[PDB]
Short mmCIF file of C-alpha atoms and ligand atoms in Angstrom, two decimals:
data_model
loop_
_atom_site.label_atom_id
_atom_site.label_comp_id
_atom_site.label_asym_id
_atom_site.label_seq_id
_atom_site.Cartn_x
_atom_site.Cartn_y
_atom_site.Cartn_z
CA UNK A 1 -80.21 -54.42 -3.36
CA UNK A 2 -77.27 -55.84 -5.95
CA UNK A 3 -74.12 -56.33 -4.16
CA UNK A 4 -71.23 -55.93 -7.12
CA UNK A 5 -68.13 -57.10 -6.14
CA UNK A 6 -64.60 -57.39 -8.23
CA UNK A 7 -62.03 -60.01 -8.00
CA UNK A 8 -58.68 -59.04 -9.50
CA UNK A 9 -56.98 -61.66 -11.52
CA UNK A 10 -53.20 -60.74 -9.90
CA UNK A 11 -53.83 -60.85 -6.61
CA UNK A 12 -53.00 -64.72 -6.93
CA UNK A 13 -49.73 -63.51 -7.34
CA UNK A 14 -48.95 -62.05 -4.19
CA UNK A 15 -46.89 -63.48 -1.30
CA UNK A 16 -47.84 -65.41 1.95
CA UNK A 17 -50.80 -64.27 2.91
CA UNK A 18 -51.59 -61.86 0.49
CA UNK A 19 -52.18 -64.79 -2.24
CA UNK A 20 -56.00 -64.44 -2.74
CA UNK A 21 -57.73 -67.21 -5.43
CA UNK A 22 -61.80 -67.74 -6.58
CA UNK A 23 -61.94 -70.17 -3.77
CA UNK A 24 -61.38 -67.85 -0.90
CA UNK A 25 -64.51 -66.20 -1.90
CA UNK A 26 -67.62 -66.36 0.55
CA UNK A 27 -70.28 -67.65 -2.45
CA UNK A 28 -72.95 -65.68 0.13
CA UNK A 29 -71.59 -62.45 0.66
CA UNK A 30 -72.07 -60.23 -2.79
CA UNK A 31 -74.94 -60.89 -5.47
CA UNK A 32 -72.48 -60.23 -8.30
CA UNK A 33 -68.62 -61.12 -8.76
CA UNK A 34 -66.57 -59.36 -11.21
CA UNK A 35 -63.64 -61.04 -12.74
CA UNK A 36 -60.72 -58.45 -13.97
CA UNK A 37 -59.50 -58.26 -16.50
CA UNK A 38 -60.21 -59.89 -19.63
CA UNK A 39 -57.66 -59.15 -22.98
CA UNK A 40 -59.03 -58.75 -26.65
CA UNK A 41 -57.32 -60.00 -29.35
CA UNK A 42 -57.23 -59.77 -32.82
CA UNK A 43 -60.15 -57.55 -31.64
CA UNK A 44 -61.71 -60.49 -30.53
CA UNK A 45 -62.47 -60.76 -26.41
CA UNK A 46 -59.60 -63.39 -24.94
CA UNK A 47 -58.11 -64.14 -21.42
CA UNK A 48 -55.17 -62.29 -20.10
CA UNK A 49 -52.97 -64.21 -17.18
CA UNK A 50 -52.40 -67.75 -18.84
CA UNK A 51 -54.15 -69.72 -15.49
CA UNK A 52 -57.48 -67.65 -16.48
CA UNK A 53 -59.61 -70.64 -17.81
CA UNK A 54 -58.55 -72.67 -14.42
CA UNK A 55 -59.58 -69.52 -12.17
CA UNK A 56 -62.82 -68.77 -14.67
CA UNK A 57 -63.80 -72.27 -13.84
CA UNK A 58 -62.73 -71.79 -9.68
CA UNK A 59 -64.89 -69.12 -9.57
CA UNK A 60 -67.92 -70.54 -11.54
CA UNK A 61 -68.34 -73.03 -9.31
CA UNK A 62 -69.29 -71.00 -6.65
CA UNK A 63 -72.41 -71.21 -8.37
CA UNK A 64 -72.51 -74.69 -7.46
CA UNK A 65 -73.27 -73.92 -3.57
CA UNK A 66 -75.20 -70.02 -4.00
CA UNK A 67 -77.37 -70.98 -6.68
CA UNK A 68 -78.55 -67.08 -6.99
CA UNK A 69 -75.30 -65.74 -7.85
CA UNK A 70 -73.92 -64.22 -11.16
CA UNK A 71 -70.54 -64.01 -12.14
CA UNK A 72 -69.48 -61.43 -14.63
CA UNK A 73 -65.96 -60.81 -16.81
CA UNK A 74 -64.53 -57.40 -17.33
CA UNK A 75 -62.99 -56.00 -20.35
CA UNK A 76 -60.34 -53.42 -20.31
CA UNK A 77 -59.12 -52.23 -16.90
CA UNK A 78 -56.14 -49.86 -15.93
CA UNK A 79 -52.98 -51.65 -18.04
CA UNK A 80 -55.34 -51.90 -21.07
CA UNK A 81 -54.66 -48.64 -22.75
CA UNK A 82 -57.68 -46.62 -23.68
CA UNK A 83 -56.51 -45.78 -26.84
CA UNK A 84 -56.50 -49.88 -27.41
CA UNK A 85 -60.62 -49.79 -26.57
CA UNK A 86 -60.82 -46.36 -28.50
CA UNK A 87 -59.57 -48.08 -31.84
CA UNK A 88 -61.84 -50.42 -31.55
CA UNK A 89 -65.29 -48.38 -31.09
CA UNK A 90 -64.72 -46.40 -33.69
CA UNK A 91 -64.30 -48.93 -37.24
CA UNK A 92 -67.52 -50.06 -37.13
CA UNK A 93 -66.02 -53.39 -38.34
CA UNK A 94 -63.69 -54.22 -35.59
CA UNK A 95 -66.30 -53.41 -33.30
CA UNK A 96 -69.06 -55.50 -35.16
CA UNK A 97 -65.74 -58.24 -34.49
CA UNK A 98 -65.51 -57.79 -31.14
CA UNK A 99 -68.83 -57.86 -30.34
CA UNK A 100 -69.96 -60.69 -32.26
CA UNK A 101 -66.77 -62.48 -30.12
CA UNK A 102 -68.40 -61.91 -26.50
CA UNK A 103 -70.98 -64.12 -26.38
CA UNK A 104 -69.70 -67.39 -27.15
CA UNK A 105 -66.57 -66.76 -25.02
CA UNK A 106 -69.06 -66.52 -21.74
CA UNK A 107 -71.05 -69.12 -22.92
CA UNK A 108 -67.96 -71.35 -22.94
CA UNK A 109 -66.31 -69.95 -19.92
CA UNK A 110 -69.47 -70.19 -17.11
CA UNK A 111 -70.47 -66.00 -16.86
CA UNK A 112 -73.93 -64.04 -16.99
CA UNK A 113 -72.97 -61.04 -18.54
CA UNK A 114 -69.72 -58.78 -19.64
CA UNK A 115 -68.33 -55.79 -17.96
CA UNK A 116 -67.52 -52.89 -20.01
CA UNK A 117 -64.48 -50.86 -18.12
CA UNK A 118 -63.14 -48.25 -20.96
CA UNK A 119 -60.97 -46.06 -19.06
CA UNK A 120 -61.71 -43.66 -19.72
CA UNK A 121 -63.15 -42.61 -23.53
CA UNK A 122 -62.46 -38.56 -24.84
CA UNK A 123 -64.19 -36.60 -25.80
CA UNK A 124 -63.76 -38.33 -29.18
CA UNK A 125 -65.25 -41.34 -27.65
CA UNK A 126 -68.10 -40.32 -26.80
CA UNK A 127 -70.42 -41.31 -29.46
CA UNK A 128 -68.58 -44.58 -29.74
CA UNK A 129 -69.51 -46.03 -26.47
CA UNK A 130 -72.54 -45.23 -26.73
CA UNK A 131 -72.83 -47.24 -29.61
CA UNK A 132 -70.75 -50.09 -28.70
CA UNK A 133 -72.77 -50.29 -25.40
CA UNK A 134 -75.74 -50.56 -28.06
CA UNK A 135 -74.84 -52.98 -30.63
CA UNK A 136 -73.69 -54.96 -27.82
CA UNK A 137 -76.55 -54.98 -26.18
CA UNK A 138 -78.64 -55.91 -29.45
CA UNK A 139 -76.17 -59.07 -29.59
CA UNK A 140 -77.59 -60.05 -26.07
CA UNK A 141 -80.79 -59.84 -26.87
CA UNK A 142 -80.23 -61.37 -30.16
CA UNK A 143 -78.60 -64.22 -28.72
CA UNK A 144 -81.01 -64.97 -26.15
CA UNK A 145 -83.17 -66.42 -28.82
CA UNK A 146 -81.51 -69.84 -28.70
CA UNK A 147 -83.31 -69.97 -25.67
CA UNK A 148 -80.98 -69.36 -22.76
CA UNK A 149 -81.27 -66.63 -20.15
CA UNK A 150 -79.97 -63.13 -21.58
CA UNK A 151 -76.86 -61.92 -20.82
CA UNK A 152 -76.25 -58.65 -18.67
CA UNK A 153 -74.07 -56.00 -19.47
CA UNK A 154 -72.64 -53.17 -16.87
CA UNK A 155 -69.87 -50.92 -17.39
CA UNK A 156 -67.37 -49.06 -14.77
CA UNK A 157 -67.94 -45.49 -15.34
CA UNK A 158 -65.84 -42.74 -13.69
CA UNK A 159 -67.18 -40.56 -11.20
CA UNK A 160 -65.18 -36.80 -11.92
CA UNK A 161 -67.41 -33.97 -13.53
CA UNK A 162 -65.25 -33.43 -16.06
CA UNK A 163 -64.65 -37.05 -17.31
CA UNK A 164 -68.48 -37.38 -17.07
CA UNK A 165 -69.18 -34.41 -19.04
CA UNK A 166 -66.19 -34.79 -21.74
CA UNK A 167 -66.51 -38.68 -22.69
CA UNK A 168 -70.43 -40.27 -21.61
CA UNK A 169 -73.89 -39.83 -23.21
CA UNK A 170 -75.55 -40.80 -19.76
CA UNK A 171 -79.20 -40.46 -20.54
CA UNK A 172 -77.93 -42.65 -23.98
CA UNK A 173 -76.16 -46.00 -22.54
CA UNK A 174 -78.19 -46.07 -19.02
CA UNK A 175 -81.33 -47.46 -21.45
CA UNK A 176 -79.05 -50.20 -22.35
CA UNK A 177 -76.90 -50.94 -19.66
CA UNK A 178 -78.11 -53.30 -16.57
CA UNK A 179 -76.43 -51.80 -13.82
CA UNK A 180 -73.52 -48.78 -14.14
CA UNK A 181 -71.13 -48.62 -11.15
CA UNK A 182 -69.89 -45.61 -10.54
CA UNK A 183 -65.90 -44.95 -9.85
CA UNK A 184 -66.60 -43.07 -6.42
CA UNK A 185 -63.41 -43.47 -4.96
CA UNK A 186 -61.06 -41.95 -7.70
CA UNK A 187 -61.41 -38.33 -6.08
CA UNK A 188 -57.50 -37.05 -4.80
CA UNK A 189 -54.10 -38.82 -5.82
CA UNK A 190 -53.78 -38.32 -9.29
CA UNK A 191 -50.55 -36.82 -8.45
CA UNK A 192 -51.22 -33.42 -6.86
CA UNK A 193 -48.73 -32.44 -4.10
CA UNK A 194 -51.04 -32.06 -1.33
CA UNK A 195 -52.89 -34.44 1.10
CA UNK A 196 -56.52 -35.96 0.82
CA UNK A 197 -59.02 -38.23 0.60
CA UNK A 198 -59.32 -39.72 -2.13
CA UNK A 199 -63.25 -41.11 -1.32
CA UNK A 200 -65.43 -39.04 0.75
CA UNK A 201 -68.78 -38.90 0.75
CA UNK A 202 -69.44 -35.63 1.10
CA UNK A 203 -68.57 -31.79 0.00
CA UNK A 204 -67.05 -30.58 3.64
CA UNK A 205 -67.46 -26.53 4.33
CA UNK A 206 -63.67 -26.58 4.65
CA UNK A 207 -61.69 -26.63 1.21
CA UNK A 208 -63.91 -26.35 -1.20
CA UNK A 209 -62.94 -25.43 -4.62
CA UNK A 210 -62.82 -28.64 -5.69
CA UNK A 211 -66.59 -28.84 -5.20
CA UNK A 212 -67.17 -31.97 -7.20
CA UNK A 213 -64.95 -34.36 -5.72
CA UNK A 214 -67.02 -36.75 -3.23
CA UNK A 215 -69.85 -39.34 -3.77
CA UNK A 216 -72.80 -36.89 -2.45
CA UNK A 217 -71.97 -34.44 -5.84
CA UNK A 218 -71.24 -37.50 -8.30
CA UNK A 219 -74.20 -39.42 -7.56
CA UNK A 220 -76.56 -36.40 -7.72
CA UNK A 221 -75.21 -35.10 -10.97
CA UNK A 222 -75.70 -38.91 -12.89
CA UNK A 223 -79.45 -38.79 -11.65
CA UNK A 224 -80.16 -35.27 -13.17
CA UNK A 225 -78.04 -35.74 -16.34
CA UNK A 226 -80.72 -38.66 -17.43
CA UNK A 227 -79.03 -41.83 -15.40
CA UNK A 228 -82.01 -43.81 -13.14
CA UNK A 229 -81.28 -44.41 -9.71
CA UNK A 230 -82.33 -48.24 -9.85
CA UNK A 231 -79.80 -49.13 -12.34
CA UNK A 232 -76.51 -46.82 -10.17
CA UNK A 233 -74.27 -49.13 -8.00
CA UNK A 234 -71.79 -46.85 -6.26
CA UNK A 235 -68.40 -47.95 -5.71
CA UNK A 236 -66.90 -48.34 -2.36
CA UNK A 237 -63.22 -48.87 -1.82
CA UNK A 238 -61.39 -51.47 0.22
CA UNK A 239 -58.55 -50.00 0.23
CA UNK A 240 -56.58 -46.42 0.42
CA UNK A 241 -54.36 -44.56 -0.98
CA UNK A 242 -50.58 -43.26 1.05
CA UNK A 243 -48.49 -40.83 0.90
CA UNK A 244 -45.27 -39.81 2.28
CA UNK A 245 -45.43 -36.41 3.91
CA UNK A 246 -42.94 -33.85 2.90
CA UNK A 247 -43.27 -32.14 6.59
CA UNK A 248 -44.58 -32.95 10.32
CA UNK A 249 -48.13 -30.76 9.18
CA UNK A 250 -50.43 -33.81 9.31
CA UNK A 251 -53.82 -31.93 8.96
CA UNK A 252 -55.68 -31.10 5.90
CA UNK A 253 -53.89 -29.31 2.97
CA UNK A 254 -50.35 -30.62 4.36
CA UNK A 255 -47.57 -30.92 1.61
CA UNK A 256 -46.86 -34.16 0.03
CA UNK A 257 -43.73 -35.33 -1.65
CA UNK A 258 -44.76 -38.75 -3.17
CA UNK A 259 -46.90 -41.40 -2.77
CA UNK A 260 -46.77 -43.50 0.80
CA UNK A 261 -44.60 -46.32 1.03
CA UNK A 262 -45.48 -49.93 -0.67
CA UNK A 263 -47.31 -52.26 1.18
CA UNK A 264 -45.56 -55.95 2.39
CA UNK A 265 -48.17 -57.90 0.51
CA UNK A 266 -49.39 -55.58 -2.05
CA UNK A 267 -46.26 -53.84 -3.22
CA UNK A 268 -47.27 -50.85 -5.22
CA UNK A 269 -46.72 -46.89 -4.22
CA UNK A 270 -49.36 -44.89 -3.03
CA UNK A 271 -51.93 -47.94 -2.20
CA UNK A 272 -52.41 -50.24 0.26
CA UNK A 273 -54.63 -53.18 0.90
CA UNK A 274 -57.26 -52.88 4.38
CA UNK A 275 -55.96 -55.88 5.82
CA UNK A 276 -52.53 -53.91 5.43
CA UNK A 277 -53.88 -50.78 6.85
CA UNK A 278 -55.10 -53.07 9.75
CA UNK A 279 -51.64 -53.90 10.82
CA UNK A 280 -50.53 -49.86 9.74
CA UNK A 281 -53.37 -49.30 11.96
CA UNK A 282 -51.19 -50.32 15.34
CA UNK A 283 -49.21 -47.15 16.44
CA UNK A 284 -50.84 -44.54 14.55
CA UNK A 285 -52.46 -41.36 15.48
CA UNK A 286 -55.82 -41.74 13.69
CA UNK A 287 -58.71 -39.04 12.58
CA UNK A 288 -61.64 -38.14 10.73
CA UNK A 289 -63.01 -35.51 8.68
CA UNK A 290 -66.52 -34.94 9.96
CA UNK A 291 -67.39 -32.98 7.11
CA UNK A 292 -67.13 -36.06 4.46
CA UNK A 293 -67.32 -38.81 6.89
CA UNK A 294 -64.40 -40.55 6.06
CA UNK A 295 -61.21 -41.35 8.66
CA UNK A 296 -57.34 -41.33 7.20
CA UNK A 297 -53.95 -42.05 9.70
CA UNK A 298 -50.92 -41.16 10.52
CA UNK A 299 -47.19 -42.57 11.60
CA UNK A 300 -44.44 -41.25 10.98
CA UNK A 301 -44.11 -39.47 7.75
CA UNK A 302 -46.83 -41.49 6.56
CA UNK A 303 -50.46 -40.25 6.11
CA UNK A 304 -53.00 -42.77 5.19
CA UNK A 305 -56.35 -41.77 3.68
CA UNK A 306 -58.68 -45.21 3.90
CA UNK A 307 -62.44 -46.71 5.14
CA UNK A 308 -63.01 -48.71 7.54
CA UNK A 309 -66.18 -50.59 8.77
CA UNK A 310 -68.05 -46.96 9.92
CA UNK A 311 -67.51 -44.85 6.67
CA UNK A 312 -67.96 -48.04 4.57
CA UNK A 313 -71.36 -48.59 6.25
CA UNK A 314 -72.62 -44.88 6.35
CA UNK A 315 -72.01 -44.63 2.64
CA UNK A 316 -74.13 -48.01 2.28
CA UNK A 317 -76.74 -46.10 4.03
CA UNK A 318 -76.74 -43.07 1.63
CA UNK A 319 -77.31 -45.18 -1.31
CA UNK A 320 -80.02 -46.85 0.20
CA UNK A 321 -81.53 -42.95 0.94
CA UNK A 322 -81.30 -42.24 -2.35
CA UNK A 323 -82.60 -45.23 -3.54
CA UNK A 324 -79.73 -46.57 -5.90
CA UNK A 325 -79.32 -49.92 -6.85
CA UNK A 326 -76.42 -50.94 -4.41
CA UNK A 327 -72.94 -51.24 -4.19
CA UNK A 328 -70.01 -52.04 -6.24
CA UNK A 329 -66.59 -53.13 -3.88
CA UNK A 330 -63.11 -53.15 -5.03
CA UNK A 331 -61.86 -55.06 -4.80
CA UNK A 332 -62.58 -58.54 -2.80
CA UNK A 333 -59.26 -59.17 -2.46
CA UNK A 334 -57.77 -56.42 -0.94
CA UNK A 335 -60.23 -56.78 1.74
CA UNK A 336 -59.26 -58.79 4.78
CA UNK A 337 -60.88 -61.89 3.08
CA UNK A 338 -58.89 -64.12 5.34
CA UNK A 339 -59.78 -62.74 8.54
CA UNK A 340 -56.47 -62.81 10.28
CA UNK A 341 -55.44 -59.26 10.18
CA UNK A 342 -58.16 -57.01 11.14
CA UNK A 343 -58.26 -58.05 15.08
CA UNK A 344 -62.35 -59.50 15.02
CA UNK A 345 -62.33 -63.27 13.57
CA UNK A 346 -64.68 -61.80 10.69
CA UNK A 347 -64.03 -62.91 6.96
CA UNK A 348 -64.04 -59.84 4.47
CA UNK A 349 -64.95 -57.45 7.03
CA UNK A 350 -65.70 -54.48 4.95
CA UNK A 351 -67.46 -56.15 2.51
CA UNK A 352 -69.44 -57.44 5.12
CA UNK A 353 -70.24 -54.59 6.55
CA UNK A 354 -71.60 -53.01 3.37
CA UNK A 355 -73.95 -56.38 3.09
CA UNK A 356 -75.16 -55.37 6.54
CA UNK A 357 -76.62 -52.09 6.03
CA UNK A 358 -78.25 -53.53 2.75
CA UNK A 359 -79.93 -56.15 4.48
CA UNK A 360 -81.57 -54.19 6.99
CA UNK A 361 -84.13 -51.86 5.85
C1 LIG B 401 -55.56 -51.34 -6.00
C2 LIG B 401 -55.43 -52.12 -7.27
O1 LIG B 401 -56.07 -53.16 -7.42
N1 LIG B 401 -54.60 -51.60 -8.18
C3 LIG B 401 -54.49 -52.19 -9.50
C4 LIG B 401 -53.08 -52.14 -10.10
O2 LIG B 401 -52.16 -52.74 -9.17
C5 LIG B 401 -53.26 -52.96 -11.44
O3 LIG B 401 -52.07 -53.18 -12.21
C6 LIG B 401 -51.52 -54.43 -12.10
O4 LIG B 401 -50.24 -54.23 -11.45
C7 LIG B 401 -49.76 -55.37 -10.83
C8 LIG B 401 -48.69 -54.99 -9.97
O5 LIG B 401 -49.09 -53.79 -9.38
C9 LIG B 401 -49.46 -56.39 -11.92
O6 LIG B 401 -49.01 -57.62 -11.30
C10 LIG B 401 -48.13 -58.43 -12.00
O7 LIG B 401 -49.00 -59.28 -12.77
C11 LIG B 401 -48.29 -60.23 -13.63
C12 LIG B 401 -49.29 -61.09 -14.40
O8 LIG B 401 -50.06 -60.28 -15.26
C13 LIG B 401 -47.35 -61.13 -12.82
O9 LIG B 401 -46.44 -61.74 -13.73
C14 LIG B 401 -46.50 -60.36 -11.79
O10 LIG B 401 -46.02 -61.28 -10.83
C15 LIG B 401 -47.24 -59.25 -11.03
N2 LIG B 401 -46.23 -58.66 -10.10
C16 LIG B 401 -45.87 -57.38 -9.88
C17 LIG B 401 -44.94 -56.73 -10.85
O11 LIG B 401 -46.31 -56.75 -8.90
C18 LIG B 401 -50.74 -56.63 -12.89
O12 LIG B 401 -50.40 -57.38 -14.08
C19 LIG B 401 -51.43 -55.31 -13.38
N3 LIG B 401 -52.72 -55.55 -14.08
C20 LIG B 401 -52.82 -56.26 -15.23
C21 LIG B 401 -54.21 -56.39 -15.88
O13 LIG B 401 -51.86 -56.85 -15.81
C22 LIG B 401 -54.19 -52.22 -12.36
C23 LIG B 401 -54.24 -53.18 -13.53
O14 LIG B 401 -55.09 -52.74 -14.55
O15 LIG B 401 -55.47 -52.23 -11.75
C24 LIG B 401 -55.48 -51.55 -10.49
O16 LIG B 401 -56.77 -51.70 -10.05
C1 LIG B 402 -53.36 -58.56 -25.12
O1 LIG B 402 -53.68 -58.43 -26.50
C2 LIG B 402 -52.74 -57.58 -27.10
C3 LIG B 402 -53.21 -57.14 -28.47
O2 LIG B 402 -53.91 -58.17 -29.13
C4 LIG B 402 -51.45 -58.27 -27.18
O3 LIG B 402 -50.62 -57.30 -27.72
C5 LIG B 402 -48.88 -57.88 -28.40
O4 LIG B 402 -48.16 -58.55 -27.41
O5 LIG B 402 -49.25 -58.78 -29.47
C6 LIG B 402 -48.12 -59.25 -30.25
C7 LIG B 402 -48.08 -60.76 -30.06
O6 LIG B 402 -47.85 -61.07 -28.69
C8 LIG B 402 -46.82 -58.55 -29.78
O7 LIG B 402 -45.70 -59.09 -30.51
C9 LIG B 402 -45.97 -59.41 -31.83
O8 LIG B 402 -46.10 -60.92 -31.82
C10 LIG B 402 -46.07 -61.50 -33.16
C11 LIG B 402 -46.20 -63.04 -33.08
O9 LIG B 402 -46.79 -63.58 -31.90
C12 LIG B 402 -44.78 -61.10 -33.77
O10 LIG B 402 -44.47 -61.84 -34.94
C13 LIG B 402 -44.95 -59.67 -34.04
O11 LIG B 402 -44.02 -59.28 -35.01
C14 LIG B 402 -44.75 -58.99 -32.74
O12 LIG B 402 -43.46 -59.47 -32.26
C15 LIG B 402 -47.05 -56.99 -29.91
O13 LIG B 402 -45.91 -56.27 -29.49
C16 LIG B 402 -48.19 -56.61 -28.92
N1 LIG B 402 -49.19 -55.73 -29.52
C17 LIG B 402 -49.84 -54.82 -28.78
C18 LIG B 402 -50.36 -53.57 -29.49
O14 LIG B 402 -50.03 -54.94 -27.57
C19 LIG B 402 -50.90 -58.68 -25.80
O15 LIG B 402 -49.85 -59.64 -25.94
C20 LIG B 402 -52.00 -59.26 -24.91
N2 LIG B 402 -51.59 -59.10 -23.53
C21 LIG B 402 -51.71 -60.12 -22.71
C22 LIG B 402 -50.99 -60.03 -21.38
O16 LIG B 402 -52.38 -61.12 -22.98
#
């Protein structure tokens, strides 16, 4: 089992507590650490917060005490527009640039592999990534000549029917790719005025319509369009999503007037760290769909849809039914990698937890 966890490169940023470097990273706990996000340049792969080659470095020498451990980059990412990625699939040229840009920048930098996250190709895309997921592989191969171990290459892929259907050749890229982590936690939010949860695992007999939206559906669509189940990692979130209720109805299909309220370390709408939901946690009224397994809170006129240590570890033990790879966690940081908010002295407690379940049987 492959335990795929991201590190995001601003959550250095982030006051008191909330400050999370390379170093605060348990070298034992996951079998593969993302770093987000690289830039590209000139179409050429380059580093994006101007500390990067200090933090590459921080977290590379993890590998100094967990020998076993690979470190990946990503590419792309959520302020990276996909139009950016989308010009640059499609001219053959600037792709051949890019590509031929990769390797050495690893090489110099301390990583095993890149990770590809486009989001999210059109349906215009389509037959790009599939070739740039290709080519680059080729370049791996290629360039594991000069007699160093071969480079991987993953790629974040989203999880909705429709995106799946409109922008991926699945049965194409999954013979190139060395792992695919699927975006299993991207399922409610996207602005629609009513409440839910955003991850759960599975369909629920109550409102259904959407009939699509949960990990159950998404992982057994990727296996039948072509995808095989030792090269899925599904994605498990260490955080949730908020929103700010627009009446006193707190069950499910309540109105919703906007996302939920930033968080004190985290400071964004609508999302909000676990170690801040631990501390949210304290005078709410707290539930759980049985249906998809997955718990969300309430407190005031704010209604929290998150995961904590049970859901996190029952959808580790689905995967391993259905014999997938393993997991992919984001992010590292937003778990409580400290320790100090959750109540149980326990470093990254989610992430943990997921480790758990893979270790056993
Ligand atoms: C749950 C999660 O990880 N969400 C991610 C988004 O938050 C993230 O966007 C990033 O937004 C943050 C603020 O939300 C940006 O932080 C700023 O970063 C710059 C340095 O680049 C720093 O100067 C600022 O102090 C810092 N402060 C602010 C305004 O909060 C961050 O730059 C964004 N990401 C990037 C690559 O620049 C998106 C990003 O793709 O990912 C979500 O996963
Ligand atoms: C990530 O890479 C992108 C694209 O390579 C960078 O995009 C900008 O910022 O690039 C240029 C240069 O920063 C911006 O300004 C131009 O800069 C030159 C000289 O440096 C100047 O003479 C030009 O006339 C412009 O003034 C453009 O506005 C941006 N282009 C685009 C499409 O983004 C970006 O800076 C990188 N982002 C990070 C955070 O590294």
């Amino acid at each position: 089992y492959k335990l795929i966890c991201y590190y995001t490169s601003w959550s250095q940023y982030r006051e008191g507590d909330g400050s999370c470097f390379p170093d605060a990273i348990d070298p034992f706990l996951c079998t593969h650490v993302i770093y987000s996000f690289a830039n590209i340049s000139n179409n050429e792969i380059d580093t994006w917060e101007w500390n990067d080659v200090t933090l590459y470095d921080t977290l590379n020498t993890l590998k100094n005490r967990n020998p076993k451990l690979k470190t990946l980059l990503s590419v792309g990412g959520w302020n990276f527009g996909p139009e950016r990625f989308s010009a640059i699939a499609s001219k053959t040229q600037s792709r051949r640039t890019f590509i031929k840009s990769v390797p050495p920048f690893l090489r110099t930098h301390g990583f095993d592999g890149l990770d590809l996250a486009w989001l999210y190709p059109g349906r215009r895309d389509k037959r790009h990534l599939t070739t740039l997921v290709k080519e680059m592989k080729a370049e791996f191969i290629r360039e594991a000549q000069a007699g160093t171990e071969q480079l991987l290459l993953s790629a974040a892929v989203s999880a909705g029917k429709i995106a799946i259907d409109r922008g991926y050749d699945i049965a194409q890229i999954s013979r190139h790719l060395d792992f695919i982590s699927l975006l299993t936690y991207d399922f409610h939010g996207a602005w629609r005025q009513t409440v839910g949860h955003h991850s759960p695992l599975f369909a629920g007999n109550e409102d259904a319509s959407s009939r699509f939206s949960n990990a159950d559906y998404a992982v057994s669509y990727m296996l039948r369009l072509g995808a095989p189940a030792n090269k899925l990692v599904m994605g498990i979130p260490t955080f949730g999503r908020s929103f700010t209720l627009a009446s006193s109805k707190t069950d499910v299909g309540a109105p919703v007037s906007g996302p939920g309220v930033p968080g004190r370390f985290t400071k964004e709408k609508g999302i909000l760290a676990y170690y801040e939901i631990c501390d949210f946690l304290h005078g709410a009224t707290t539930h759980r769909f049985r249906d998809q397994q997955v718990p969300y809170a309430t407190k005031g006129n704010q209604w929290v849809a998150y995961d904590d240590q049970e859901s996190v570890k029952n959808k580790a033990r689905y995967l391993k039914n259905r014999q997938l790879a393993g997991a992919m966690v984001w992010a590292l940081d937003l778990d409580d990698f400290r320790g100090t908010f959750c109540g149980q002295n326990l470093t990254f407690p989610l992430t943990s937890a997921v480790k758990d379940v893979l270790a056993e049987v």
